[PDB]
């Protein structure tokens, strides 16, 4: 509770989620520079409406993009503080509101071990979790090919973050890996390109199957 208020004096100044300065990191590649909202500021929730335009989804705070592809899995059933759930899932059968907590605790659990600005470990995990080449079963002229298709910087990001957010929910499954943890131990190891990231195992295979087919 007192640290919590220090976390209210500190984001003010300016810093993400209470104590992560948005200047600590830089986007070194000139590819992922206009596609990423590292540079702008303070809160993900924002509600700034996206997909409004052609690229009304590139200007989305990196973390907000995280929150709602981390929020994804969800039907019908009913949640409230009662007895009451699940209904908000292994990935928010429900809101970005109790989602934003998970990503905050995962920034807390990835800061606790690495000790770096965690927005330097995640932006280092969404330039590596994206495959550089993909095969589409594309036919053109009635002729069925399985072809060299190179990936665009916007469709990169998306496959980076989504594969990060798809890998964690196989592990969190009825397991001590809490998403605040299971995400925080995915984001470190996608930053590293480690052999333990279900998100850097598809990145590779999607380039390697796509190299054969070309």
């Amino acid at each position: 509770a007192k640290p919590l208020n220090e976390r209210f004096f500190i984001p003010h100044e300016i810093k993400v989620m209470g104590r992560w300065s948005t200047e600590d990191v830089e986007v070194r590649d000139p590819s992922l520079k206009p596609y990423i909202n590292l540079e702008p500021r303070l809160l993900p929730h924002t509600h700034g409406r996206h997909a409004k335009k052609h690229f009304g989804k590139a200007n989305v705070h990196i973390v907000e993009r995280l929150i709602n592809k981390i929020m994804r899995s969800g039907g019908s059933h009913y949640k409230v503080a009662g007895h009451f759930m699940r209904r908000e899932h292994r990935s928010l059968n429900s809101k970005k509101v109790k989602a934003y907590e998970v990503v905050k605790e995962a920034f807390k659990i990835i800061e606790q071990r690495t000790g770096k600005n965690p927005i330097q470990v995640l932006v280092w995990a969404i330039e590596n979790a994206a495959p550089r080449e993909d095969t589409t079963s594309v036919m053109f002229g009635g002729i069925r090919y399985h072809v060299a298709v190179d990936i665009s910087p916007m469709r990169r990001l998306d496959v980076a973050l989504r594969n990060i957010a798809l890998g964690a929910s196989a592990k969190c499954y009825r397991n001590k890996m809490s998403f605040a943890e299971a995400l925080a131990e995915e984001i470190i190891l996608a930053a590293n390109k480690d052999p333990k990231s279900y998100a850097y195992s598809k990145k590779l295979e999607i380039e390697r199957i796509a190299e054969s087919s070309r």
């Binding site: 009913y78 409230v80 503080a81 007895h83 009451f84």
Partner: peptide, 12 residues
């Protein structure tokens, strides 16, 4: 106060 009771599979 804020708080519920079960009915069954019918939602609370």
């Amino acid at each position: 106060y804020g708080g519920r009771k079960n009915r069954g599979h019918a939602p609370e």
